[PDB]
Write a protein that binds this DNA or RNA. Structure first.
Length: 52
DNA sequence: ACAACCTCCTTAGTACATGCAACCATTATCACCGCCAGAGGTAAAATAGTCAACACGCACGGTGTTAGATATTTATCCCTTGCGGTGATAGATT
């Protein structure tokens, strides 16, 4: 699919299909107000709009 | 009249900062032994008592029966799963 007829002016790019700009990571205690020997994952993701 | 100066004299004033680990010995040296103190000993009687006797009298614990609880069994019920149909989201615009 890289050996098709591409005119002198048809520019070419990779599979750009997703606009996310950060994904982070932390770990601290859960909210679960009584079941409290247990942790939570945190990931602080960030984009450009298009999806929160 | 003293002044400091030439030389090697000796004296002696100091030697940066933070922290952790380890355990606490060596001496010899007559203390004599005489006296007597209150002061050690203990017999006999105060400050008072033991524990064995024969009584007294009670608590506790183990054997027995009873009680009822619990953990099992059974079976019911609901809350949940996963997929699906199609939801008004996300957010761009009005």
């Amino acid at each position: 699919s890289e050996e098709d007829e591409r005119p002198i002016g048809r520019l070419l790019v990779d599979a750009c299909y997703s606009p996310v700009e950060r994904i982070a990571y932390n770990v601290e205690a859960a909210r679960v107000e009584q079941r409290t020997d247990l942790d939570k994952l945190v990931i602080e993701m960030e984009t450009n709009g298009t999806i929160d």
